[PDB]
Design a protein around this ligand. Structure first.
Ligand SMILES: [Zn+2]
Ligand SMILES: [Zn+2]
Lengths: 144, 24, 137, 136, 135, 24
């Protein structure tokens, strides 16, 4: 019946480029490591804080040196109500994370640019798939 | 263990500025 | 003839933490700002120096002591500098350059704070010459 | 079936604060005017440039004076292929504009702050809704 | 006395007409840089100093405009206790000089947004615009 | 003549969207 976005904010941000400025002397042959996960917390009546955790690490291959590492905790407070257990699970692990992704994308993008590295625009992520992992991992725990 | 987390060695240093550094 | 050129401006490290969200948003916004600053230089080539501006910012709410947010920025730049006497060069590396880097760091701090949806924080101008007089002694 | 982001950039930007610094003495009772629109252009094989147009004007109610006016033309080039006419229409008028919005939001907030006005973070736009207004 | 009361932007403009195709040309940039300042007394001992910066970059082997950026960076200063000449230097050199780095960062910021290679305006000798004044 | 300035010719358009365009 109701899904409303109350507030979008960042809880934690980190960007590091340890090997500057010499790393810019190496051949830009980037190898991208991308980690992602989500977590929810009830913060009030029908109020949930959904947090999208994104970790990105880029290294140059013909050297292994780290170009930059970027970790972001993008969050949003949502008003959610009127959903069956499964509908709600999909909303918290897919729908909401998906609304927060583009904001995290831009944050990562912004930080990478500040290090003067070539643009990094995270490719779209299918959260439905993460939702399926949640289910499957639950059909496993509830079955012990 | 996040890059900002407190390094697991009570240095007060952040993981990334202590045992997690990647400088070279 | 002396020369001072900007080769590159980049960020070596950034950190922004907002521990007590979203509940901190319920307290009365009575901010107490802690601001730390420092600079460091390193020659990275012939006439090439990397000047680094370190800025640390911590804001707490007074009637609770809770941390609203912590923000640390390591703003840097590679400059081409040559033709200056020991004193002239020291002023250039501890005042001139850091001063060119400041507005960049300022914008990064404001950008991050706004992302935590906290009221705007635009660091006040810093008189780096005060940091030069200290360096000399 | 494909959807990739090739490049995100701004084509046009404008920020104006006509009545400074005196406007800073009026009581900050803001009236926000917000206009939005999108447009697409095929720029190659399976390459489309999607443009998000954002217009924002803030006036102070107790006098009608303009505090600031900000216009942004945020764009991006996407590789899109393998979608039925409807699917593609949704992707060009909702999906892509949606990916560009937070960038434009950041730019508007960034410029507004440079004018030392209180923070302005545009609220989320449901583009799937602006897609319906398109089929009509 | 010389104190900075507030630093703000009065007008900003960034345009890159030939996108996205211009990104296919060889990046052989030709930079056009225009600058000027103007002062206005806005109160007792209160002056608004405005730094006007215009930057236009074109690619030489085509002449096409990569981007044009115009900025009107200003600041309100509390100034007092200066003879006519010292005051003139303060308004046309000292103050504009305090404002420059902020304008530099703005140009830099906008250029980045267009995904063009970084442009960090070289330092400007404002004492020169002071001399031009006197003359 | 500024980019954001009204174009000299009562168009209503900003000078950059009228007689100041660099659209090749
Ligand atoms: Zn350690
Ligand atoms: Zn005209």
């Amino acid at each position: 019946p109701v899904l409303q976005i109350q507030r979008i904010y960042v809880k934690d941000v980190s960007f590091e480029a340890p090997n500057l400025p010499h790393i810019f002397q190496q051949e830009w042959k980037p190898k991208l490591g991308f980690d992602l996960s989500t977590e929810t917390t009830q913060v009030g009546d029908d109020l949930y804080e959904v947090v999208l955790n994104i970790s990105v690490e880029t290294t140059l291959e013909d050297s292994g040196d780290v170009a930059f590492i970027c970790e972001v905790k993008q969050a949003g407070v949502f008003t959610i109500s009127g959903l069956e257990d499964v509908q709600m699970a999909h909303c918290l692990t897919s729908q909401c994370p998906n609304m927060l992704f583009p904001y995290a994308r831009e944050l990562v993008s912004n930080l990478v640019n500040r290090g003067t590295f070539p643009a990094l625009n995270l490719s779209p992520v299918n959260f439905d798939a993460l939702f399926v992992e949640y289910m499957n991992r639950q059909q496993a725990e509830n079955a012990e | 263990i996040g890059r900002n987390e407190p390094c697991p060695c009570g240095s007060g240093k952040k993981y990334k500025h202590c045992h997690g550094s990647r400088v070279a």
